[model samples]
Target chain A: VTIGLAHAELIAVVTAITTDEPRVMTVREGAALPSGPFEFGHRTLQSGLREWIHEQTHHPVGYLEQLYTFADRGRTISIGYLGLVREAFWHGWYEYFPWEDHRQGRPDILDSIIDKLRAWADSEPDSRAQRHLRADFTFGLDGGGWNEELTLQRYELLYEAGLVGEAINFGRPMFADHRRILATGIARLRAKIKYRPVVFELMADSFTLLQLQRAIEALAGLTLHKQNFRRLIEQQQLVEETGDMKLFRFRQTVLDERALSGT
Target chain B: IGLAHAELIAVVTAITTDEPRVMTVREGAALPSGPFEFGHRTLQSGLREWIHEQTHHPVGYLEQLYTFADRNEILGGRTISIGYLGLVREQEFWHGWYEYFPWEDHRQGRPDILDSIIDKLRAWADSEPDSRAQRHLRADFTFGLDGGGWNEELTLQRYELLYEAGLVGEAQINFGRPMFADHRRILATGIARLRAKIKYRPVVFELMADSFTLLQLQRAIEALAGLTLHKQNFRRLIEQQQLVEETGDMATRPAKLFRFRQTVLDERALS
Candidate 1:
């Protein structure tokens, strides 16, 4: 769930993302995003987040974005946000889900998993929950257009299909509540892309144009037209050539000068 | 120390290129940022200070985007991030540093590195424990995997995912320079803001020369957002919208150069 914070008090119930896998961390096994009760000591909600992540992971974080906040069945209030760490080496929660790193290629389970989600959505009861589930997950309904931003919605859809652990057995959870946390991160990211230029947070100082596009595509999980992508870059003047090309065994090679030199 | 909290500073932006190719400035590693202190007496003042300090150029057009908070999981201290979007003319200092982040440019074609990364991401998704993880892995690897659609937005999300998966330098796992706390995230916030802002507002005018060819103006907009627009459609949109008025000046190029009507800004709310 997402929450807007002010003067140490969580103010609003925004939204929430829920995942099925239990994210593993040094402290506990769960699928929940890190959260806490608001306190007066905090000047703003952002401060509370900095304190929480540092205390839990001992790794310095570089970026954070609000995800959503929601009211749970219990009186407990939850606020969600997305965090970006520079370099995967920073010690945090990496040992677990080592396979989640997709900087290489398509994971083996993609097709099977999507097929299952489609089937599960179709097999729902004729209740409001079922209809809502189908509408939210499937594109072309209620103005929903394959919103790659709905990372949480996709996760929740999978969970309800009994594809992940959270939906299968409420027992043997990873952390206190990690699935929910993962969902929160995805939701925050999806919403953030609509109006912010956060894409540079992960870029290298010097890279090939292809590398930059790949990073964006990886995050959005979509394919972009090559010619169109180049046209956009050239038209936008977002990058410059380094006048040096990388030698590779592949088709063609070109290197780009980083846009943010110092930063 | 000072009740450290995530707070939204004024939105910072820059036009990194001109005609042939240009770039913006670099204020050390941080983009220009400042508090919303009323001491300046206006939001634009705060923005001007931030931009001038960072790029040494006067900001032209700026506007409010949205206000958002940092995620609790990674916040180093107590803070809130207020996001803003702004625009400015292209400056030379930025071109000097354009080579630093080469991957950001897509002027030529898709870089080769994408294939390697997409393939790897796809494989990683496939090996997940459950079918659900695999599906997400597929979705991420395919659409976001290839730069397929001109999302023109989703700037922050795309950046964060790369960092999380260790695809970019900041998330490089080893041997990489990192921004302080949430600076990168703030940068993403600015990108998303400007991208969406351009659709409804004439902030794009800030990036153009005082007078320019319609094609030049269109190119400037495309450069900032990294998306291609229909030429006729773009021109049609501008003309019908009454965004510009002819200066009776023509350029040597095949097309005519048109001056942006500053009065239009005053005449309309710019949506």
Candidate 2:
């Protein structure tokens, strides 16, 4: 017997979640994600790959994790993935959005954004302009604090500001909201690193001890960061041997799992 | 627009003073859902459009949770469901989520229903004659035995296991209130997703009404968590994070009213 059901499946997409000059990957020579039509598989709750890889940031690709699913209109929904990489096409995630990153230090672009936002806030008394003022908190301009986790939010604001090439592109032209989807992947990785053991996946190369500070200890919690992550690592002896650790905290030291497991 | 789709939306909702409820269709038999339709908007807006036809109320504090294709449903010979967690405050569009899975709620500290089910699950494991004894592992992870403690996030794992065991039924199972087809499973997902989300995000505000006291907020969180938080630690953490602003309002005790602020959310988000 034939079935007369009327519905369509969506596309499976993956993103590379790179740190230390984070990058975005796209299909061959083109700047869009790799994808394929998904056949009904048992792992129904989640949905991925790269062929002819063209990079956006200079790092070589490493570690793949599912990011999110984006379904717009009747088009097949787009699933997102995050991975770490080595050779990237872009210099750093900050160069693309120079204003947002504060890892090394807050960029002057942040001050410019604030000043520009202040101008918009005072531009008019109408809600039309007031909307821009309201959105300023989104970029942490109005003391919201520059949260890198809102990487997508910044890209969105720039896109709306009649900007594209200087908007979110990685020296590559836009493709099917692919750049829009990339914002989400970066934002997902930024938010996820604090809570997941998955951070170790990226630490093999450039993963820094980002959340080890008391400022972000909510992820480590009240007890045992001493467990799982080990204040830092011993095989690397990044922390343990530093009897002169002297409150240096974890610097962006590289950990080789080959060195970590000793297996 | 020449395509077919099934819009399986999980409008994970919490109404005013919501004690964990799920919206249902067909008199609480199936989840409130619709087939995907070609619209200018997207999955979430389509949800609002589809839902308004059923109940005029709209959703708030929304976030996408997951996308899944059913083992049975094939639309245009394939299928995908994009689920969303929507915060709402309209109890009329509601049914007790616990009614579907009473064993899941530990709001009152390990429901008596769970103990009985644990015993029943032990028997079910024994009944599997080959004695692979894997059921014990399956039972423990799903049911939180062997020092795993209670993880509210294991909702789907537990429900699927029970279904695999063929120990439950539609509108049956003296313990868990069941529903039609995969709706029960979706409900489990919604519960688990919300339970896990609140820890990192300040989504608790979306469920709350105006001018609540600190105690009121904690109780609401505990209700969703299905466990009690440390009173001192909870209060200290709230104060430290500055999640609430006192409105100097008092009802039962000499308590104060507070509002959710974006700034406070940013601060807590950092840590």
Candidate 3:
């Protein structure tokens, strides 16, 4: 296989929140991420990314980083970014990867999909079998609980088994493999929050512990145990009180940018 | 002029045996990459075709790492270097990965060769008169100056610092090994990609045997991690995650043979 000339694209996944719902910024009603090519006039790839988002949303964003470069087609290198914004039209990840959100419980469509997946696995042999076996194991179809991080793998598997083509209420199917890009974004953020204090990026400047937990739950797709969440947050010293003594629902944890820099 | 065509490239990586090895050519100097040529299909198949020519190893788990822009090397042109992380069960010809970034390895503590580079880095820090105080702290953080703790994920950041300092870049493959171009840095991108990936995804298992000992598992992880893990703690976490299974076939201590419990990909974060 040979490929011809290619260009890099700056794909921004500017995510933000409304009360507790985590959302990603997009164009034409969540059909695609804001993308543009690396033109000669741009000073840098980052500047190009900033320029693209600025054209779409009026200004540059904070907390931008390269997420991934998808090379599915001949060669359209997509440089993904996870930016935090306060205001934007909201788009939930479940719009495309509905199976991904298990915050409430294991999604119901999983069982119906996994049944078809097993048949497809049985149809193949050797490496395909091994692939299916790995797929089976990854999708948590075996009554083992769901892992939120396998978003992309699950999407690909569903795509392979013709489940995606058939399902109706599963999630919004995207144009030009944008669903895969969104999957990569969601998985990146899901995996990222554990290490970097990025969930705060999607949060308000000051929030109650409950609101923080809810924001985390929205993005993470795992309903964290309340005590465990509080313990981990406090123990890690990721938050400080606003010196407000109120009901459990009203106590606030005000965060400053200094917390990200000190470490 | 019509838009200058870009040469899209790929850096393929693999782990031969239990040791994570990056596939390099030019006598272990560069990653497997080339100009993007019209393909029968997609960029991925295009990448696989080139890698197939360079090495016989079957690359497992291919994922795009990062893409770098090359504006300086070729004038009136665009150079898009797309990096990838790959894992293979075995490759007949390869080298241990630490050769490029010896400072990266922390298995036994800081690799001693960093000793020579640190003082120069300190001088480089001191020479930054306006940013001296900031430079001192950054040097300490990046290279773990004077025994500051090392952050495993900063592979590219630390290496690029040297590149920026003129210790390594452009013609500085003299310090490491010669490559066609900036492929060494490309390789660093791949390494950093793999290191950060394994902590979250079970991408490391693509290099493992169907049945393996926990020791073998940890060794492969350590190799990819470029740092050693505490054995007891490693096992405890592995077991807690339920990502491996007792094979129940002549498994014992030291070689408590277990298969990667592929199901955990479903059940747990498995990080």
Candidate 4:
């Protein structure tokens, strides 16, 4: 039997960081990620994304990873990619996820977000307990410690609660499921940093430990303990002392072979 | 637009005798795979139906591993293989994973075949002056030479490196068994994916019996990881994850039986 042709679409969550604020590259004034119908002439999926990014943003991608391939009932199969660059106004990710940042302690917006989610849960009496459990886990409420990696979960929970546009300062929604894809990139990168030394790609050639911490905090959207963070970095052996004044550079040799994994 | 067809490939894995095994067809040479047909509804459901029809072995947990569009040899047009990882219990045409990747099995420390492979890899790296440093670093990282500790999750990288270095081939029997086309490479991808996945997700339970001793569970995990775990550390981690519960059933070894706590599935932050 002949296999029917399927349309391939590519979506990218191209991210950059400047001054401790993780920014995502976007077209149409931050309304959407750089995406379009997959065109031929490109050798592979990765190069295709690079070509698309070059044509639109003209920025070279330091790293590109396939995030997920989603197939709908039929027809279109949208493939998502997560890209990191060495270098957007509605660009800062936290702008779309006000409740995500906990660097200044938990965002005040979460207080109302939880209340709204609880109300949404109460409305569904049958699945209320499960819904509440999910909300608590996603939002880190009621003893559920804030897991910075649950960015996608939080955004989804908010979307499910129909609270996307409710708050005056709620995360600005993107076109279609672009916001969800963005969250996927955020969550992946957040989890990735704990093990992989990918954050170095976003950093300059050399920087102080405090500068490194700021970049991490920006992506994680949480304030990490200074001493513990420094200790962790030392333990990972990811960075090496540079000749410059109290600055460090990512240790290419060590990271290349070092067995890095989640704690 | 150039026309390309998609093929759904399954790397259904199972553990028995503390040895990891993968389902294979055509006399254990290739994985169970079928072309993505027009009659299918969803990509997943199509594979589910295909696997059932072909093997009659139900897939417990299925996850998309990767999609290879770097086309393979199919005459009229290119074929994009969307690889999927499947976990099953006590299964096969099941071929032992080590048969294809002997060096990867570190359960008994490093394998002897690794020594020659490393030497050849070093030579391969040294031969290239233009890219020598980069090649040396890649070989060192991929093969765990020169104080680079062995990482089990780099199965695909290891295979790709060997293939590039001309160490692995259809005719080369020493580097471990080779499958037709890129099936072996795809298999490596599945193994690597599973090894990394088990660290975070409690997916090992999907390959387990309803009730098992803690040792049984640990063996199942060790089989897939190709590394033995410290008994206490493994148990502590499992306990902390709260992934299992006592079944009140007893075994001949006087060990208590345990079943995976289904609630943990729902308790994940999100799907």
Residue pairs with colliding backbones in model 3 are A2-B37, A2-B38, A2-B39, A3-B37, A3-B38, A3-B39, A4-B37, A4-B38, A140-B266
Worst 10 residues of 2 chain B by lDDT: B262-271
Give the number of the best model, judged by lDDT.
4
Task: State which candidate has the highest DockQ.
Answer: 4
**Candidate scoring better on lDDT of 3 and 4:** 4
Model 4 TM: 0.85
Measured against the true structure, the TM-scores of the candidates, in listed sequence, are: 0.46, 0.74, 0.81, 0.85
**Residue B6 in candidate 2 has what lDDT?**
54
C-alpha positional error of residue B32 in candidate 1 after TM-score superposition, expressed in Å: 1.4
Query: Candidate 1's residue-wise lDDT over A70-99, tens digit each?
Result: 323112234555554333131222122222
For model 3, residues A24-113, the per-residue Cα lDDT tens digits are 788777777787777777766777778888787674577676776665443455567667667635577776677777877888867777
DockQ for all models:
0.02, 0.25, 0.29, 0.30
Residues A1-263, candidate 4, lDDT per residue (tens digit)? 44556666678888888877889998888888887655556677777777777777777776677786666433566678987777742479987888888889888988888778778889968998888788878885455778788887787678777888532336787776777788888988988776655576688889998898888889889888899888878776788989988899988765444332210
Q: Candidate 2 chain A: minimum summed lDDT over ten consecutive residues — where?
A: A254-263
Better of 2 and 4 by lDDT: 4
lDDT of 1 by residue, B46-125 (tens): 55676667657665555544444433434433444444555555544333212322333344555455456566555545
Tens digits of per-residue lDDT for model 2, B189-252? 7777787776655446767776677777888777777777788987776776667787666667
lDDT of 4 at B173: 24
